[PDB]
């Protein structure tokens, strides 16, 4: 199916307190598989999924030096951005960077990504054609002209077209038992009285992977989406996710309400009811 | 605009100190220094960017460098040894990008010697074409011979009627030794200039062989009878023969 | 630990024939790979730059390929011209000791010689007189094919330089030549080129 690989980077400066904090993470789909933290005693890229631990030492060295080098480049970029935006060296500022690739069900490239944010606002982003840039302001256009002169886009396009896809396919085969075997949600419905006239029907979806899921309440085959308290999908903490949707139903009408669960791990969309 | 380096050549004694200058290209903020020896090839020494040292290789602590406000760079090689004899190149790039090109200067060829008594300028001779060569073929080959010089910092150029010519010119790629088993032995270099027989048999044509020799500089004292073998031009010449 | 190796250390190709130059490196984690041309007297010139994730780069008659997995690169030059004669250097840009550092690592190079097509050779050994001396002479072996391997002096009293090509551009006439001289009294130009495999149909004048 459709899959993705992503690398996230965050550099936060702390002037006078020392070096900026640097944290980078890698994700295949909704699975964290690598991390690097500058505040960690181990100044190296760490494995975060079991299927990446079969990678040899040469791999873990390369990813560590790249992460360290990204920490140093961000350090320099933050000082450069103070100059472009004419800011004092006293404030604390944030530099974020995201890059990666989507692949379709055939394993070919869907979309390539590389974008940078300064203090939460877009700075410069590679376009979809992998051959041009979108700059947010004149400060970012300074960087753009330099990156155009240094042919930054040609390397990113080669990586996004080649190494990014080929190594995402490699990860997908090595971790197929989890990355391509969706975890179905364990589901149940709870009943919580409010008054002597009304109660809450809360539909639960637990332990499912990936995070994409649809919880919908229906009263006699009619969508109650307008009056559904739906919570944002949240991590359980063991690589799976949780979600629930609630509706306020009149006392004695519970059986008229049905919770429908759609998920790629389900061989059939569930239809749950209040079961006392 | 390109990378410029000075001086072109340097012949000095052991234990001395030399300074190599470099002007990067316009717009290039980073400078690089490389050492191209015969034993190790091109080796990275040090990198500066906008006055600040950025990268460093296996440079010795007796080798110091600096990038000045004008972005030009200096490489100080002190306590010189025989192993420091190499071609020292300067490069420059626009910034510190991993995706672009470094641009190189012509380099400074440095020669370090134990004793400077082996330094002699060349003695240049011009040899006129064989008349047998002028009857068999209708061509005339001049031969220039620069002999008895050390070290091998020489540039031979042919000058016909006051203008340097490169068509019909062939110079040996490397000087050969007179005592091959000696590393401080004199050198010799030959060069050929082939023209048409009608061009040689015109006595109003002037042929000159010019060897530019690079020798000792001002930073080397000379306490000896022989004339100080400094950087100089030694030439031989000949005219046409009807 | 990054080390670059090029094979062969020197190469002689016939004019007009395609050629290939090989290169290998020890560390697969590189920023870019470059092919340089170094000319004696001049400096270094970068011919091609292959990005870390590219596979090939093309510039005119040049085609370079990069294979980081095997740590190898190949420079292909089509229709070798005599002007291609130079030392071809293989460089990789890869990280250094410090975080964010990078440096070019160079191979020893490949000295390429494009010998021109010597059709209709006229091997001969002429003697030339010094313009300022009658007792000083030099022997000149010229106009032989590029197959003739000349050899250095048979006796240490003699000096022989190896072959070398001159191009008379105005009439498109390229010719091989080598000189030999000595201080010996019995230094005849016949015995000068007596250690080299000289063609028998060589014109030996008076």
């Amino acid at each position: 199916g459709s899959h993705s690989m992503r690398y996230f980077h965050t550099s936060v400066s702390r002037p006078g307190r020392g070096e900026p904090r640097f944290i980078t993470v890698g994700y295949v789909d909704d699975t964290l598989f690598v991390r690097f933290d500058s505040d960690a005693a181990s100044p190296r890229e760490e494995p975060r999924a079991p299927w990446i631990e079969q990678e040899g030492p040469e791999y873990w060295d390369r990813e560590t030096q790249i992460s360290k080098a990204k920490a140093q480049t961000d350090r320099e970029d933050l000082r450069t951005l103070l100059r472009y935006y004419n800011q004092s060296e006293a404030g604390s500022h944030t530099l974020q960077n995201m890059y990666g690739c989507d692949v379709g069900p055939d394993g070919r490239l869907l979309r390539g990504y590389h974008q940078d944010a300064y203090d939460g606002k877009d700075y410069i982003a590679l376009n979809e054609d992998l051959s041009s840039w979108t700059a947010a302001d004149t400060a970012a256009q300074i960087t753009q002209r330099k990156w155009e002169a240094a042919r930054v886009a040609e390397q990113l396009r080669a990586y996004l077209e080649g190494e990014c896809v080929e190594w995402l396919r490699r990860y997908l085969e090595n971790g197929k038992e989890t990355l391509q075997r969706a975890d179905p949600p364990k589901t149940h419905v709870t009943h919580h009285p409010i008054s002597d006239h009304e109660a809450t029907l809360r539909c639960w979806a637990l332990g499912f992977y990936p995070a994409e899921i649809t919880l919908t309440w229906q009263r006699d085959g009619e969508d109650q989406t307008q009056d559904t308290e739906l919570v944002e999908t949240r991590p359980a903490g063991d690589r799976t996710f949780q979600k629930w949707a609630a509706v306020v139903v009149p006392s004695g009408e519970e059986q008229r309400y049905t919770c429908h669960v759609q998920h790629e791990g389900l061989p059939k969309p569930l239809t749950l009811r209040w079961e006392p | 605009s390109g990378v410029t380096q000075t001086p072109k050549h340097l012949i000095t004694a052991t234990g001395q100190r030399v300074t190599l200058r470099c002007s990067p290209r316009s717009g290039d903020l980073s400078v690089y220094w490389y050492q191209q020896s015969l034993d190790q090839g091109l080796q990275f020494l040090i990198q500066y960017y906008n006055g600040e040292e950025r990268a460093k290789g296996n440079i010795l602590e007796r080798f110091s460098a600096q990038q000045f406000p004008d972005l030009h760079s200096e490489l100080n090689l002190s306590s010189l040894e025989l192993g420091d004899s190499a071609l020292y190149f300067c490069a420059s790039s626009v910034g510190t990008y991993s995706t672009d090109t470094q641009y190189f200067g012509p380099g400074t060829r440095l020669t370090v010697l134990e004793d400077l008594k082996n330094v002699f300028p060349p003695e240049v001779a011009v040899f006129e074409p064989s008349e047998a060569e002028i009857s068999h073929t209708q061509k005339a080959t001049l031969v220039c011979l620069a002999t008895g010089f050390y070290p091998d910092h020489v540039e031979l150029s042919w000058w016909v009627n006051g203008k340097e010519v490169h068509s019909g010119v062939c110079t040996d790629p490397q000087p050969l030794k007179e005592q091959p088993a000696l590393n401080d032995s004199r050198y010799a270099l030959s060069s050929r200039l082939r023209v048409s027989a009608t061009f040689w048999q015109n006595p109003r044509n002037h042929f000159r062989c010019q060897v530019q020799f690079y020798g000792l500089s001002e930073n080397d004292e000379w306490t000896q009878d022989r004339a100080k073998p400094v950087t100089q031009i030694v030439s031989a010449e000949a005219w046409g023969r009807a | 630990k990054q080390e670059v190796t090029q094979i062969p250390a020197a190469l002689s190709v016939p004019e007009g024939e395609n050629l290939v130059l090989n290169c290998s490196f020890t560390d697969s984690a590189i920023y870019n790979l470059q092919w340089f041309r170094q000319d004696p007297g001049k400096g270094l010139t970068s011919l091609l730059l292959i990005q870390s994730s590219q596979r090939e780069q093309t510039s005119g008659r040049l085609n370079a390929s990069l294979d980081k997995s095997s740590g190898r690169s190949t420079l292909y030059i089509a229709a070798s011209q005599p002007g291609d004669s130079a030392t071809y250097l293989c460089a990789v840009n890869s990280p250094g000791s410090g975080a964010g550092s990078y440096q070019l690592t160079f191979g020893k190079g490949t000295k390429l010689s494009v010998i021109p097509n010597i059709q209709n050779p006229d091997p001969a050994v002429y003697q030339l007189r010094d313009s300022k001396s009658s007792d000083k002479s030099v022997c000149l072996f010229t106009d032989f094919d590029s197959q003739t391997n000349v050899s250095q002096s048979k006796d240490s009293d003699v000096y022989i330089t190896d072959k070398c090509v001159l191009d008379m551009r105005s009439m498109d006439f390229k010719s091989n030549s080598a000189v030999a001289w000595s201080n010996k009294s019995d230094f005849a130009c016949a015995n000068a080129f007596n250690n080299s495999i000289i063609p028998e149909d060589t014109f030996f004048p008076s």
Binding site: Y84 | T99 | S52
Partner: peptide, 9 residues
């Protein structure tokens, strides 16, 4: 696999 690139602003 991360990309190897140094592209300062």
């Amino acid at each position: 696999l991360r990309v190897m690139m140094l592209a300062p602003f």
